[PDB]
Amino acid sequence: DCSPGIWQLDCTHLEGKVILVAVHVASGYIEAEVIPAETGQETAYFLLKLAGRWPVKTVHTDNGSNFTSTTVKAACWWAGIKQEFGIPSMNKELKKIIGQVRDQAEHLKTAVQMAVFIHNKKRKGYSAGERIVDIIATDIQ
């Protein structure tokens, strides 16, 4: 897609831990966190966080059941987030970056944040970081 407010949320697995990955669909910009468990509470909280930082209008996911819980629904309700029904793989890419930098850090969560840094700063010609900023700016002005 190309629309400024569309985000993609999924959980992926590494080392028996779970990684919540949000992708800004138009930019390829990523926000990712290690969460203790794959619950609605964790997703609901992350949504709240994400919505305060970026203008989040619609959220897509590859696992619809992610968004069925009352907590998640409460977050989408309060932040004014609709579910994306317009989109009918960066978890592969992010895992590559985590694997390259894993030895550098003790905790997986630390390695994840390093991978988010690298991904968002690498120029492919802008970076994902510059792309998101320009996309939201030109949409605002």
Ligand X SMILES: Cc1ccc(-c2c(C)c(-c3ccc4c(c3)CCCO4)c([C@H](OC(C)(C)C)C(=O)O)c(C)c2NS(C)(=O)=O)cc1C
Whether 94 and 29 have beta carbons less than 8 Å apart is answered as no
Using rule CB under 6 A, residue 103 touches ligand X? no
- One-letter amino acid for residue 122 of the chain: K
Q: At what angle do helices 108-121 and 128-140 cross, to 10 degrees?
A: 60
Using rule CB under 6 A, residue 44 touches ligand X? yes
Among 13, 107, 121, 123, contact with ligand X (rule: CB under 6 A)? 107
**Least Cβ distance, residue 126 to ligand X (angstroms):** 24
Closest by alpha carbon to 99, among 121, 114, 87? 114
Using rule CB under 6 A, residue 114 touches ligand X? yes
DSSP alpha helix (H) spans, 11-80: 40-53, 70-79
Among 110, 127, 133, 136, contact with ligand X (rule: CB under 6 A)? 110
Using rule CB under 8 A, residue 137 touches its own copies? yes
Using rule CB under 8 A, residue 45 touches its own copies? yes
- One-letter amino acid for residue 50 of the chain: L
Using rule CB under 8 A, residue 55 touches its own copies? yes
Residues 70-129 that bind its own copies (CB under 8 A): 78-79, 109-110, 113-114, 116-117, 120-121, 129
Using rule CB under 6 A, residue 97 touches ligand X? no
Sheet holding 82-83, edge to edge: 30-35, 17-24, 6-14, 58-60, 82-83
